[PDB]
């Protein structure tokens, strides 16, 4: 988190189909998103589908959800920031 630049939030991205499917269940459908948007929408999606909770030792549990299929893990810590960006980057392309 400390070594992640604030400029990351401005990266412009095109979600691959499965990630786009998830995003469209929580936000406006667009072709190009910022990473700020993707993180916000994923966070709301997680909360909405109860994949994360108080006192779960900061773990998101996604094995019963399409998110698990996108990310290819059954669970992950919200504290593992660089791993989160890697799992996200597998499901989008950067637009420049
Ligand atoms: C309103 C809902 O909030 C979500 C949330 N909780 C967090 C706690 C900490 C955190 N980091 O260190 C600690 O000790 N805690 N970090 C992030 C975080 C923020 N931005 C980028 C990155 Cl990579 C991580 C947190 N998020 C993000 C919005 C959320 C973004 C989507 C990502 C796939 C999973 C995390 C909950 C999961 C549903
Ligand atoms: Cl699902």
From Swiss-Prot:
It is linked to Seems to be amplified in certain tumors (including soft tissue sarcomas, osteosarcomas and gliomas). A higher frequency of splice variants lacking p53 binding domain sequences was found in late-stage and high-grade ovarian and bladder carcinomas. Four of the splice variants show loss of p53 binding. Interacts with p53/TP53, TP73/p73, RBL5 and RP11. Binds specifically to RNA. Can interact with RB1, E1A-associated protein EP300 and the E2F1 transcription factor. Forms a ternary complex with p53/TP53 and WWOX. Interacts with CDKN2AIP, RFWD3, USP7, PYHIN1, and RBBP6. Interacts with ARRB1 and ARRB2. Interacts with PSMA3. Found in a trimeric complex with MDM2, MDM4 and USP2. Interacts with USP2 (via N-terminus and C-terminus). Interacts with MDM4. Part of a complex with MDM2, DAXX, RASSF1 and USP7. Part of a complex with DAXX, MDM2 and USP7. Interacts directly with DAXX and USP7. (Microbial infection) Interacts with herpes virus 8 protein v-IRF4. It is found in: Nucleus, Nucleoplasm; Cytoplasm; Nucleus, Nucleolus; Nucleus. This is E3 ubiquitin-protein ligase Mdm2. Phosphorylated at multiple sites near the RING domain by ATM upon DNA damage; this promotes its ubiquitination and degradation, preventing p53/TP53 degradation. Autoubiquitination leads to proteasomal degradation; resulting in p53/TP53 activation it may be regulated by SFN. Also ubiquitinated by TRIM13. ATM-phosphorylated MDM2 is ubiquitinated by the SCF(FBXO31) complex in response to genotoxic stress, promoting its degradation and p53/TP53-mediated DNA damage response. Deubiquitinated by USP2 leads to its accumulation and increases deubiquitination and degradation of p53/TP53. Deubiquitinated by USP7 leading to its stabilization. It comes from Homo sapiens (Human). Induction: By DNA damage. Ubiquitous. Isoform Mdm2-A, isoform Mdm2-B, isoform Mdm2-C, isoform Mdm2-D, isoform Mdm2-E, isoform Mdm2-F and isoform Mdm2-G are observed in a range of cancers but absent in normal tissues. Changing residue 43 to A: No effect on its ability to induce apoptosis. Belongs to the MDM2/MDM4 family. E3 ubiquitin-protein ligase that mediates ubiquitination of p53/TP53, leading to its degradation by the proteasome. Inhibits p53/TP53- and p73/TP73-mediated cell cycle arrest and apoptosis by binding its transcriptional activation domain. Also acts as a ubiquitin ligase E3 toward itself and ARRB1. Permits the nuclear export of p53/TP53. Promotes proteasome-dependent ubiquitin-independent degradation of retinoblastoma RB1 protein. Inhibits DAXX-mediated apoptosis by inducing its ubiquitination and degradation. Component of the TRIM28/KAP1-MDM2-p53/TP53 complex involved in stabilizing p53/TP53. Region I is sufficient for binding p53 and inhibiting its G1 arrest and apoptosis functions. It also binds p73 and E2F1. Region II contains most of a central acidic region required for interaction with ribosomal protein L5 and a putative C4-type zinc finger. The RING finger domain which coordinates two molecules of zinc interacts specifically with RNA whether or not zinc is present and mediates the heterooligomerization with MDM4. It is also essential for its ubiquitin ligase E3 activity toward p53 and itself. Residues 2-95 are annotated as: Necessary for interaction with USP2. It comes from the Eukaryota. Residues 2-86 are annotated as: Sufficient to promote the mitochondrial pathway of apoptosis. MDM2 RING finger mutations that failed to ubiquitinate p53 in vitro did not target p53 for degradation when expressed in cells. Residues 11-94 form the SWIB/MDM2 domain.
